[PDB]
Design a protein around this ligand. Sequence first.
Ligand SMILES: NC(=O)c1ccc[n+]([C@@H]2O[C@H](COP(=O)([O-])OP(=O)(O)OC[C@H]3O[C@@H](n4cnc5c(N)ncnc54)[C@H](OP(=O)(O)O)[C@@H]3O)[C@@H](O)[C@H]2O)c1
Ligand SMILES: NC(=O)c1ccc[n+]([C@@H]2O[C@H](COP(=O)([O-])OP(=O)(O)OC[C@H]3O[C@@H](n4cnc5c(N)ncnc54)[C@H](OP(=O)(O)O)[C@@H]3O)[C@@H](O)[C@H]2O)c1
Ligand SMILES: C[C@]12CCC(=O)C=C1CC[C@@H]1[C@@H]2CC[C@]2(C)C(=O)CC[C@@H]12
Ligand SMILES: C[C@]12CCC(=O)C=C1CC[C@@H]1[C@@H]2CC[C@]2(C)C(=O)CC[C@@H]12
Lengths: 322, 322
Amino acid sequence: DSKYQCVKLNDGHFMPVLGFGTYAPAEVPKSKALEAVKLAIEAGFHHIDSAHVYNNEEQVGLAIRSKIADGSVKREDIFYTSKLWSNSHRPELVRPALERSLKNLQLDYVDLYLIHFPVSVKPGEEVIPKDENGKILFDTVDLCATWEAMEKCKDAGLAKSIGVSNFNHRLLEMILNKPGLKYKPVCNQVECHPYFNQRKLLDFCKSKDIVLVAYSALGSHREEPWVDPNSPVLLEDPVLCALAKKHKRTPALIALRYQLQRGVVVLAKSYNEQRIRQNVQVFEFQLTSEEMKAIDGLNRNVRYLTLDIFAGPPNYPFSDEY
Amino acid sequence: DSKYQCVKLNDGHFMPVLGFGTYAPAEVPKSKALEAVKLAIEAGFHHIDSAHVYNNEEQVGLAIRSKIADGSVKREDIFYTSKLWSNSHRPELVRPALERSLKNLQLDYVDLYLIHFPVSVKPGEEVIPKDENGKILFDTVDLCATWEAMEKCKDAGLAKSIGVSNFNHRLLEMILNKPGLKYKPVCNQVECHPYFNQRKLLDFCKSKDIVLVAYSALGSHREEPWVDPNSPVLLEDPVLCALAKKHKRTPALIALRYQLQRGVVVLAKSYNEQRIRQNVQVFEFQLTSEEMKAIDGLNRNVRYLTLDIFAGPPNYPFSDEY
Ligand SMILES: NC(=O)c1ccc[n+]([C@@H]2O[C@H](COP(=O)([O-])OP(=O)(O)OC[C@H]3O[C@@H](n4cnc5c(N)ncnc54)[C@H](OP(=O)(O)O)[C@@H]3O)[C@@H](O)[C@H]2O)c1
Ligand SMILES: NC(=O)c1ccc[n+]([C@@H]2O[C@H](COP(=O)([O-])OP(=O)(O)OC[C@H]3O[C@@H](n4cnc5c(N)ncnc54)[C@H](OP(=O)(O)O)[C@@H]3O)[C@@H](O)[C@H]2O)c1
Ligand SMILES: C[C@]12CCC(=O)C=C1CC[C@@H]1[C@@H]2CC[C@]2(C)C(=O)CC[C@@H]12
Ligand SMILES: C[C@]12CCC(=O)C=C1CC[C@@H]1[C@@H]2CC[C@]2(C)C(=O)CC[C@@H]12
């Protein structure tokens, strides 16, 4: 209980292998993230994933400090992730954005800070800046300079570990090859589930001792207009539903356990007390090789989150094969 | 260095996934055991595996206490395993054997106690009792009764968890189907390596929430007469050597990593300070799907430890398919 399952990252820190997702669609009020994160900690989640752009870090920070102050957990046993939004990729703005997140959290450091998405937009107060014709104002930024600035955040102790999200093979290579590289990314957080299992990019990341962290592992929030409402619903999949019945679990738990067995650190968002608790059952059963092969067979090239609002610049990550 | 990778067992306890093997052939002085377990703890091993029959518990116990007393580690961060030898299967001899191990160790409890080998031999003080012409004297003991005595040792707090070693499918079912079963075995510790990968037994264990723990994962001690001197040397395999070269590791480290990635808890014995430290590097890289498949391909029905001196009784575990 005072113990939990973690993986060693390439900088020597440890990451719990089940993480709590905190993004909620625009219609959901704030008090909701506060209570959900408390419940998550209560249930046994020790890894909590957020971002500046989720507009919840005040509530998330409060939940974590509340659970430390009530004695449920110590700060050392919470692994909190934040992410740098694309209007702060300029290296002059990286540390201020991190300090801005720490101030909202009222925490002294994050355990992990990520580059949220590799397409940069113009700096300023708008998170999606637009021109007088409604066109997104993209910015030309060298992400190797952004990386340098993230490395100095780790040196300052403001982020214990640094990594990336939504990077493809070419963009990881660009960082791993950077002149004067000090710290590799510990992770690449990307969409990953049995309809899009990312085996090629997963193998690339394993070959470089980068951990792949899976978001939308339950099929995503399905929030319009980010996700099309006619994409297939992952947790309705017949093979997952059959395995869940066989195991007396649930399709979600099957989807979660698949990732754990393939060496993926898996996130799961739920703001529902029963499902938050149910998701921790991932550690209570195992899948056989034939079950794991049946789930591998489900891959169908369904990307829920294409984020094509950001397509056009060379750093848009999803037009490459991987 | 206060975190480390563990798996949850079916009784709620946690087992670190790399364990330090302490058996050495007769010719090696027992002082090497004391020194080796101190090095292993110093290198970051938190799981230590021994047995009454290894004749080293006085030394292993002293190593553990020496590292507790020096402030290196706390008792709650060592996972210590002992095993019940076959001269003590009669239920009335199970607790006296556990107490005898605890007195030799000077510990108040083991974290794990296993039935070492399912064939029983005549009770008394010899661990391999022989007749007038040097033949083993076997005994007829109902392992379900043995198991009940094991459950009472767990209830007494003298073993935090209980499990088995060298059990096959049939023998595990015997236990799982016993009327009145209180505690399933948490594990089945068996020979496991790329030449004998146990995929059938491993799948069955995963389906029953039992963790398979691999011994002889580096290809065994190769001690004669227990291991056929003509059997192939695991760590000379060209697939393992090629993956070690690709990874800038060693064939031993590839064999260890393979087990971690298939959900097996792996032991490694070394009494060499350099190799003890090297073996912990298992947490510093990852194998790709392609490399895992290539290692899967090596399976070749080579069992180093046939233990065929115990063949004949029906509980001899290695005749069955799995
Ligand atoms: N790096 C990035 O770009 C990025 C972008 C997106 C997201 N993320 C991170 O990844 C997290 C997870 O991804 P996601 O937000 O898309 O959602 P997800 O985890 O795939 O969850 C999808 C949905 O599953 C439901 N659910 C959860 N547990 C369940 C269970 N046991 N049974 C049935 N349904 C269940 C949730 O509804 P209820 O809440 O009603 O349970 C939720 O709406 C995010 O919250 C965020 O922290 C990162
Ligand atoms: N349950 C049971 O029936 C059972 C029976 C047998 C054993 N076991 C348990 O499992 C343990 C391990 O099995 P094992 O004793 O057969 O041996 P093992 O772990 O397969 O292999 C040990 C041999 O490998 C060498 N070695 C270790 N690390 C190495 C490296 N990095 N590179 C090259 N060589 C390396 C050791 O030599 P050095 O020492 O010289 O380094 C030794 O010669 C035992 O010690 C015991 O704790 C259980
Ligand atoms: C990152 C994000 C949330 C998590 C998710 O899954 C999908 C998106 C895509 C667009 C982001 C959005 C969060 C809020 C943003 C910044 C806006 O206010 C307009 C664009 C939008
Ligand atoms: C059980 C054992 C240890 C670990 C291992 O690898 C397998 C063996 C070989 C046979 C056992 C031995 C321990 C020493 C034994 C018990 C004797 O005193 C005569 C037979 C011999």
